[PDB]
């Protein structure tokens, strides 16, 4: 049967969404999060298979959500979070890869802003250059909580392109020397996104890949890496 | 168990998709034209729950697959049929707004060429104006099918954005005034990837709202609309 | 003596025009077409030399006229004739160079849509890419045209630049990539100042060169390969 | 019969040119000067009417050429002239409007620098500003000239766009908010040519209409503004 | 005499600055604080009168030196500094504006990236955006000083500009939709040159005009704010 | 004590600079110019260290004060001498470097316009290029005083950079390819100032340093040079 949409793109009821929401790419890892780590869960969106759950960390409301691939697919998903659900903290959750010679594969980063070569963010600022940057309390939280857990980390810029499949001669040479740490598809398009709704958002990834050296994480261990970063993540949510 | 995976992002086995495939947006609606036009059929992707099969249509080869919302998305998994895949022709099949004083709810649009907000096609050809623009015989493959089976279609160009959820004071009055018939979000970055390739590609699309008059076609309108514009598209296979 | 000027730049009377209109870079070659294949033939403008005439093609009203060299020529008189003189239809008719490897001197090309080097049609859609597309009517016409005479054609996208002395690095290697098979200086500029006017225009050209292997057509294979082109947009009028 | 091309453009044999040339839009005013001030005139190009000539001016060499409308077409022809036919120092003869509140109808003006809504100057200096500037010599030989005719002038700058038919809002505002005297469609593209071959332009026009206070030049007033001009123009040659 | 330059702006010898260093842009205020705030002290540089000093606080050793105003000017300085003299940590302490609801004068602001309309950081990064972006170690030391002197602070993103006699309509709400809290003219250029030499930089302002309420801090209350901030900022070098 | 500030940036009173100043980047310049050539001066600024002095050159009035480095800063002390000071005519006097071949260490280069790699012009223009360029009596003013003291010059283009320490693979070929004459830092933001208040600049530079070959002014020849070109600037004024 056909049931109301509060959104275009979810069927979750307004209030279904907790305060806080983690978000990753792939749906289907949301559903291993939440079946993993939360408990009194609930599916509350399945929209375009965009699975989505609501639940507690350790006896406080969190739901865990896909975004899909790219910039103009979290901006959907993440606005209606937002302006419909009435979301506060968005933490993104994915993986990435590097260009950085000192950050290597199985590394957890801590995003503090994110470039693109998207123009979505020039369309909110005149044309100009405005950063996407994470909320300091966020961040805050995730370095401290991977402190707690005895787990490094490096902290700092990541690049969200909206071409995984990049022919750009160049880039990397000046990533690299600049020192961005990840290189991903979405976290630029979420900073702003929280900020126009006064609200906060954040970024941790792990290193599945480094693009120079071609080094690239096993099933094996980008399953552990996942487990720590994962963990980071809901540890800081209790934070926030 | 694992699989081996040809792509990141699709496990399907070299060969195992069609020359020809049509896309969407939504893998359950990929599914549901599998299962209710397509025979021989058999699931051949999974990952990332993005639905893709490949079976026969009045015995052709034909795949059907999801490519999920905004440019970044469908440039991966075209990049990738047509690359790893070695598809020859994909068709988009998807809805759209519009804002045309002449084009109205329900309304049949076939693509000629997309504008867009993206920067991908500026940085393909040095920051210049590089067109996205469909395959003629893929075009009037499209037109023929709709004549045959006496559909009514609006043919011309399509706007690809970045943003579902514009704030951009002027864009719709400038839309209408150059007589864009479409607003969606991926069309634009299909076609110069079918170009890089030496392959084809197209994309017809169905008005569910009219983004100047606020109409929005009901679920039951949507479903007969989605009937007419699949029929054409399934029939224009045959064709190419 | 002095006339009445309708435009600054156009003699002709308002009427003078019919609504279907050929263009050509050279107004000398305005003339010749003129005095071979129309009947009822009168020059109508004669300001600053950019001869246009008016007359029938197969009895159907039918007019010629230069249009100059670059999109801001063809811009001013094109504007015009759908402004001032309420033409519906113009079909460019012109040369080009070639660098895709499929494409040959004397080979004629029927446009679908144009990229360019200018800023002017960013400067119609708010910044933005906005394709400059032919109207599919009168791109079939013109193949179905072709067809009928047993005239192969090439079909697909022209490249527009501000700058014949090109001095650009990797300019043509993009264009190869991307399969745009005709460079020329004009179709960019007319197929949006159509959309405006809600009318309709097309684009064909003959290669005089190959920019990458250097061959070059002769005078008589020039006039060949104009004859065959003109007979394929004056038939294509007679359905337009 | 068939005439050998020094250039596709260009029928005049090498060294039919003289080492200065005065150009204006139109052919016919071109042959205008060349018929009225010019003596052992002959012309030396016929190729797509843009008529041009080679006498003298008060024993001096001086050639005169039509250039077309916008900054494309003035480029091939000045590309070639600097290039091809080894001409030392071009001046850009025309007509213009004003937006200034104290540049009236009738002004003559002297250019000496000229922006523009083109894209040409920028694709020559990595994409920055290059401003398009007149030879100081010939800016000093114009004014001088001026002033021995006792003919007053206006000395600043122009503005070339590409689109005589501008929709552009706030544009009018902005050339009189910073005092541009000159609105024009050619002066831009020509300087950089210049500056490229180490050799001279400048630029002299008058104001044929006031675009803010829609004040208009009769034929007549048209007629002495040019007489007043080309002596001006023709003067400076001497010294140049 | 003449003396030596290791550069042309600074007449310090290679050493003679600490690896931390504030600056400001007022050289005069550099001034204040050494003779305020350090022991040790000689001064280093005095060339263009941007007055510079080495000195230590609570014993750790500490530069401070004027940086004038605007991006180009303190990208003078501080590439030099990473560069010649091998600092290894910058502060920026300055005064900005505010546009926040929220922010209100004399309040403390501490940046941890800053957005700007100068095209500095799209030349590092192939036109793409590149966040300015302060170090994390820096913010934190800044934010945990703070709290240690019980002095609240706002902590987010500044805008660099180059115009401080600002035109631009719609600037201002734009900046206050996305939560900028500082407006000031030089931080963006600092941030992507400390990352360039792998190094670290932070940015602390005080707020000294509501640009919207127009609210101003009289002398009195900026010497109290700026008594705070440089506070602040010298027990933030203690754990950097 | 505490003074009164009719701008934020300098002290001096209203009507405390004559209509004509002098600019330099160094203030300590500045003072050297008041010392050496000024009668009856006074200092009449020093916020900042930024020097400024009225008195007379040759009994007719005029002022000298530093400017600092680059358009930002000059921005700001340009726009408050036109719009609070009412000066009607401002001559920048520098150092430059250059590219081109055939200009050399310790010329005279006086500036009729200069490109740049700042986006402050393309704010005032709408986005396009605004070319800042000199007023033309004020560039022959120095032409001819130059002449007078039997001083060779060059005359042309300028190129103003935000970045001294440029990283810019190309720039210096395309600058000398054009013949750019002069490159240094602040030349393109004060022309464009002077434009919006109706007023009058220019500028004149030594060049110290060929950035092609290498060679560099000694001190003392840099003191030379600076002689030539400031008795050319202080002679100018008496015609301005
Ligand atoms: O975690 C999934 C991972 O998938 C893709 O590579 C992109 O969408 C990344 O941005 C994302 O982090
Ligand atoms: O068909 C689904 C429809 O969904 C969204 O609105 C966008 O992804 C469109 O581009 C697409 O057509
Ligand atoms: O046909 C003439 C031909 O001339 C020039 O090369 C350009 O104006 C082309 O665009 C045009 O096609
Ligand atoms: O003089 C002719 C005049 O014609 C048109 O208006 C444009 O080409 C101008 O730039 C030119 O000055
Ligand atoms: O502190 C001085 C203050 O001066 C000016 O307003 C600008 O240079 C600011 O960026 C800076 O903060
Ligand atoms: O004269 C000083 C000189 O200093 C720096 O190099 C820049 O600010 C130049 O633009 C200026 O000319």
């Excluded at 969404?17 to 609930?42: H, Q, S, W």
């Excluded at 260009?99 to 044309?127: F, Q, Y």
């Excluded at 909320?135 to 939280?141: D, G, I």
Aim: hydrophobic fraction near 40%; include cysteine; proline fraction near 4%.
């Amino acid at each position: 049967h056909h049931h109301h949409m509060a959104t275009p793109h979810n069927s979750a009821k307004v209030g279904d969404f907790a305060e806080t929401v983690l978000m990753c790419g792939d749906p289907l890892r949301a559903k291993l999060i939440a079946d993993n780590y939360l408990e009194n869960a609930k599916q509350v969106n399945s929209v375009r298979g965009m699975l989505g759950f609501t639940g507690t960390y350790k006896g406080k409301p969190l739901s865990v959500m896909g975004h899909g691939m790219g910039i103009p697919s979290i901006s959907i998903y993440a606005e209606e979070l937002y302006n419909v659900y009435k979301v506060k903290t968005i933490i993104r959750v994915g993986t990435c890869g590097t260009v950085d010679p000192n950050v290597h594969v199985r590394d957890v980063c801590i995003v503090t802003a994110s470039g693109t070569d998207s123009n979505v963010n020039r369309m909110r600022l005149l044309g100009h250059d405005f950063p996407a940057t994470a909320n300091f309390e966020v961040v805050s939280a995730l370095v401290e909580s991977a402190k707690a857990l005895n787990i490094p980390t490096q902290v700092g810029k990541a690049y969200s392109t909206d071409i995984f499949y990049s022919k750009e001669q160049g880039l990397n040479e000046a990533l690299a020397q600049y020192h961005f740490i990840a290189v991903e598809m979405e976290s630029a398009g979420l900073f702003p996104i929280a900020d126009y709704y006064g609200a906060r958002a954040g970024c941790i990834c792990t290193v599945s890949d480094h693009i120079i050296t071609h080094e690239s994480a096993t099933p094996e261990e980008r399953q552990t890496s996942f487990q720590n970063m994962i963990k980071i993540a809901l540890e800081a949510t209790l934070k926030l």
